[PDB]
Amino acid sequence: MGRILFLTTFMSKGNKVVRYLESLHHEVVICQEKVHAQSANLQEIDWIVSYAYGYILDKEIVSRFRGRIINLHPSLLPWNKGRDPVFWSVWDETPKGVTIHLIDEHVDTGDILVQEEIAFADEDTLLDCYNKANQAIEELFIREWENIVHGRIAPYRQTAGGTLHFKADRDFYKNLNMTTVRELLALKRLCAEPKRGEKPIDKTFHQLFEQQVEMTPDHVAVVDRGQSLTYKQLNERANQLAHHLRGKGVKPDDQVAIMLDKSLDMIVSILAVMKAGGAYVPIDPDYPGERIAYMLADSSAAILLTNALHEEKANGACDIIDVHDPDSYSENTNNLPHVNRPDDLVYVMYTSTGLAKGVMIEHHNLVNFCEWYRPYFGVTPADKALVYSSFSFDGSALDIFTHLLAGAALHIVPSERKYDLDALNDYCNQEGITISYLPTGAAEQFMQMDNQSFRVVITGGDVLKKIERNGTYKLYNGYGPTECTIMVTMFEVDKPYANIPIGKPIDRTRILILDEALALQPIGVAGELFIVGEGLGRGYLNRPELTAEKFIVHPQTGERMYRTGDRARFLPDGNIEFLGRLD
Secondary structure: OOEEEEEOOOOOOOOHHHHHHHHOOOEEEEEOOOOOOOOHHHOOOOEEEEEOOOOOOOHHHHHHOOOOEEEEEOOOOOOOEEOOHHHHHHHOOOOOEEEEEEOOOOOOOOOEEEEEEOOOOOOOEHHHHHHHHHHHHHHHHHHHHHHHHOOOOOOEOOOOOOOEEOHHHHHHHHHHOOOEHHHHHHHHHHHOOOOOOOOOOOOOHHHHHHHHHHHOOOOEEEEEOOEEEEHHHHHHHHHHHHHHHHHOOOOOOOEEEEEOOOOHHHHHHHHHHHHHOOEEEEOOOOOOHHHHHHHHHHOOOOEEEEOOOOHHHHOOOOEEEEOOOHHHOOOOOOOOOOOOOOOOEEEEEEEOOOOOEEEEEEHHHHHHHHHHHHHHHOOOOOOEEEEOOOOOOOHHHHHHHHHHHHOOEEEEOOHHHOOOHHHHHHHHHHHOOOEEEOOHHHHHHHOOOOOOOOOEEEEEOOOOOOOOOOOOOEEEEEEOOHHHOOOOEEEEEOOOOOOOOOEEEOOOEEEEEEOOOOOEOOOOOOEEEEEEEOOOOOEEOOOHHHHHHHEEEOOOOOOEEEEEEEEEEEOOOOOEEEEEEOO
16 A cells, blocks of 8 residues: 555564554565665555654755654653653653654654643552553554544644753663663652752851850850850950951961861961851861971961961971960951851861871861751750760861850860760760760760760760660661761661661762762662752862862762762662772
């Protein structure tokens, strides 16, 4: 009756479509390559029927066969034009269906001939959906072919709108072919881009702190032994030192070294550097003199805040400001004119397998963590927290910065009870300490101590393993590198686990579990843990090449991501599970 040209690249040679047409006594020429006008495949052809044909017909051919080029596209056009339609129908959660339509001079925009809705089960695999879709459209073609031949169908233009996808848009999702609709949509909710509406963080830390001072000015801010400062007292003293700092030339993104033991002078010095404009570089004086000399060298710090006691450990490296010389403090107690942006440096902390690298953290990094910490743990001015961790580690940033913006009171931990945790337990029961973060090592020990003051304890760092504790406080396990600011995930330990999970992401952060090719892994599959979002800092100071290696631009998405080097996987309940290092 007529010679039909069947164009396809993915479909086999014996589809129900081809065999049905042959049963109607049509010679079906099958071709799986791009063709031109001269092609012997176009000689004495009556109808062209395309079905998953991965090439574009020349405009010369579309005109000669106008009204005689039929296409089988397993989507509900205009939804999911282009490649991998069924997959994007599930992922983008569009209306699902199959369409037989005419061919325009563009991609799958020609007028429709016939169309019908299809349904995918929540348990079908995307391969199952691919097969159910192709079967449905093939049966439809067989049903409606006679109406198409005799030209009795009235073609209607496609609804406005839709979506379009190209061949490479699925590269990032290449490992998801055998996942279930359920499993796939869950992966979307966990790893999909942020929804519209969000705005950039617009506050620095000392902005939010100066705010908290005006709301609880007479509340206790920090306590060391018998002495204490209020928020107003702390703020005014920090201002007095900040004025002197900015006078000696401190400016945004400038580094200012602080070498002090835990004390009131430390909190004053930290806030003073911030309020002055710069970022503080903490140096624990108990470090070997070699690391100290190196930290001052790598850091561009021209100024060092320190005692007369530790003054000499610097060997005249920088202009020293004695925190005990009344000349280092101005008369002015007012808050300084703001000159900082959320993307300015707030602090620089080092980590060391090789040399120590200066991790740069910006205000917006710190602000995000604190603003998540307050409501997550329900912190209120009624609370009291320990300043336990060394102020050269990011754990101190948790102790100091989070609780200061909640209006709580900080309690300095001196040397005598840093390691003696039974004596520390007594201090907590006396002063009524309510919340604090202890590294995994020290947290496991405190479980043996009989405690009644704590309401929350947070741990992280090494692998948590012990859980049984005497007190009646909630235990929280968290995880995160100093490169992405303190922590990025948090778990409330409720029951014992052989492998305690590290929890779900905090505000404005996502965690992606990728393969070696940086492609998504289905939920439950192990892979390298990548961090994305507000937590990511600026990178390593004076290590641009190393920064590029660890702070990557993703090949497909193009989002900035941090390569942790850690092995993990998502559990069915959304909590992340640590699975050791990669090497």
